[PDB]
Amino acid sequence: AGAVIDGAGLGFDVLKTVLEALGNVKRKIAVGIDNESGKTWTAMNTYFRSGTSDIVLPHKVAHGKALLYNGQKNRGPVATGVVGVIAYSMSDGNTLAVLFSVPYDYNWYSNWWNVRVYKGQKRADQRMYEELYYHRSPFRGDNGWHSRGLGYGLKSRGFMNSSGHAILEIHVTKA
């Protein structure tokens, strides 16, 4: 599962459509990551701190392609939201990691996201979640764009909306 498209085509409308495919689950997320890194990406794993997906990370995401992925709250009366880390291996032997955090209760919490390059093949897990959420200055899902250099000749530019029906759009480009 998990579709790929031309990166040039990635945008808010495309991700809204992804979002809408999932239906009115109370908390969910549509994730688009645009690979303009100059390298081929290959899926490693997704670490869900909470929530799940019915789909699989697109296995291969070439330079020039964006991946569309999604996540949703666990079924039933569960209020831990959809919080996770996506990990792709890049053809230079390093890892691109993406954090998403979509809480249940917006009267307490907010959406957050982050992006980071790790040296080597590093699977998403709890230590990476904690680093990206608590240590590495994540960006608020505040309906605004945020840019930052990643090192390693790359940078990120991304956008996350503010709500429980979440949209996360990230572009990883050469710096």
List, as residue ranges, the binding site for N-acetyl-D-glucosamine 6-sulfate: 47, 49, 134
List residues forming the annotated binding site for an N-(acyl)-sphingosylphosphocholine. 27, 49-50, 75, 81, 104, 109-110, 112, 129, 133-134, 140, 164
- Encoding tokens for residue 104? 């249940």
List residues forming the annotated binding site. 27, 47, 49-50, 75, 81, 104, 109-110, 112, 129, 133-134, 140, 164
Nearest alpha-carbon partner for 7 in 169, 151, 148: 169
Coil, strand or helix at 16: helix
User: In the beta sheet, which residues pair with residue 7?
Assistant: none
Answer left, alpha or beta for residue 29, where phi above 0 means left and psi between -120 and 50 means alpha: beta
DSSP element (H, E) containing 13: helix 12-21
Instruction: Please give the Cα distance from 70 to 56 (Å, whole number).
Output: 9
